[PDB]
Design a protein around this ligand. Structure first.
Ligand SMILES: [Zn+2]
Length: 257
C-alpha cells in the first residue's frame, strides 16, 4: 500500500491514484514574489470556541485529532470561501530533521512541520460527499518552526505515547485548537488537492504566513511515533510529507501586502 518509503512513496502514488498527477495538486511552493495581493479577499473567520474534540488516532501515516462535526461548532468561513466549512480533524506532517517536514514551502524554504486543520463544506452534508467536490474542503495550513515551545500543543504531545502504532486511538476530549494558531491570520490561498492519496482535487488551501514555534522536545516526540502496527517491525513515523507539486495553471493569492 502507499506510504512514504523508497518503494511506496510520493513518486509511486500515481500508479494506483492517477489524479496524483493532476492539474491542481498540492502541496506547492509558495513563491512570495509572484503571489498577488487580492484586495477582494475577506478576512478569515476562525470560530473554534465551541469545538468538541473526541479522539486522537494513529492511522499509519499521521495522527488525527478528530472533532464532532455533527453540528456547526468549529467553523471556518470568509477569506476566499463561500459558505461555511466545519472542522473534522487536524494532523501534522513532519521531518526526521528540523530542516524539513513541511509540505508547502515558502520561496523553497522547508519548515520543520506543517499543521493541517481540515474542514468540509456544509452544503455537501458530510465529509465523504464533500471530499468529491471541487469546493468540498478548506484546509488551513500552518507552518511549524523549532524554537520556543507551543503551550497549546503540549496536551497533544503528551498523549502520543498512548497511540504509538498504527490503528491505536485514545480519548482526546476538550482540546482547544485555538491554542495552535499564530497571532496573525494573514494567508496565501490557492486551489489544490489532498496531499495524500487519493489526491482528490477538492481543496481550497489557506496557508498562514506566520509560523508557530514549537520546541525541539515537542517535535522530537512526534518522531517517536510508528508507521507500523504493534508487533510489526518498527519504522519511525518521520518524513510523512509530500513534496511540492507543479503549480501549472494556478495563481496563488495573498490576503496581505
Ligand atoms: Zn495533511
Amino acid at each position: 500500500h502507499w506510504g512514504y518509503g523508497k518503494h511506496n512513496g510520493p513518486e509511486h502514488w500515481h500508479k494506483d491514484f492517477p489524479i496524483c498527477k493532476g492539474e491542481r495538486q498540492s502541496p506547492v511552493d509558495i513563491d512570495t514574489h509572484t503571489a498577488k495581493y487580492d484586495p477582494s479577499l475577506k478576512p478569515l473567520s476562525v470560530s473554534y470556541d465551541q469545538a468538541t474534540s473526541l479522539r486522537i488516532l494513529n492511522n499509519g501515516h499521521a495522527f488525527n485529532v478528530e472533532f464532532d462535526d455533527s453540528q456547526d461548532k468549529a467553523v471556518l468561513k470568509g477569506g476566499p470561501l463561500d459558505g461555511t466549512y466545519r472542522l473534522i480533524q487536524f494532523h501534522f506532517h513532519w521531518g526526521s530533521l528540523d530542516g524539513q517536514g513541511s509540505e508547502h514551502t515558502v520561496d523553497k524554504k522547508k519548515y520543520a512541520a506543517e499543521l493541517h486543520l481540515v474542514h468540509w463544506n456544509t452544503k455537501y452534508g458530510d465529509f465523504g460527499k464533500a471530499v468529491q467536490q471541487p469546493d468540498g474542503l478548506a484546509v488551513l495550513g500552518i507552518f511549524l518552526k523549532v524554537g520556543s515551545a507551543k503551550p497549546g500543543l503540549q496536551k497533544v504531545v503528551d498523549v502520543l505515547d498512548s497511540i504509538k502504532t498504527k490503528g491505536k486511538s485514545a480519548d482526546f476530549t476538550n482540546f482547544d485548537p485555538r491554542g495552535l494558531l499564530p497571532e496573525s491570520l494573514d494567508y496565501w490561498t490557492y486551489p489544490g488537492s489532498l496531499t495524500t492519496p487519493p489526491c482528490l482535487e477538492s481543496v481550497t488551501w489557506i496557508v498562514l504566513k506566520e509560523p508557530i514555534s514549537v520546541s525541539s522536545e515537542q517535535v522530537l516526540k512526534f518522531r517517536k511515533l510508528n508507521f507500523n502496527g504493534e508487533g510489526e517491525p518498527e519504522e519511525l513515523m518521520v518524513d510523512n510529507w509530500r513534496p511540492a507539486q507543479p503549480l501549472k495553471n494556478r495563481q496563488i493569492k495573498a490576503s496581505f501586502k
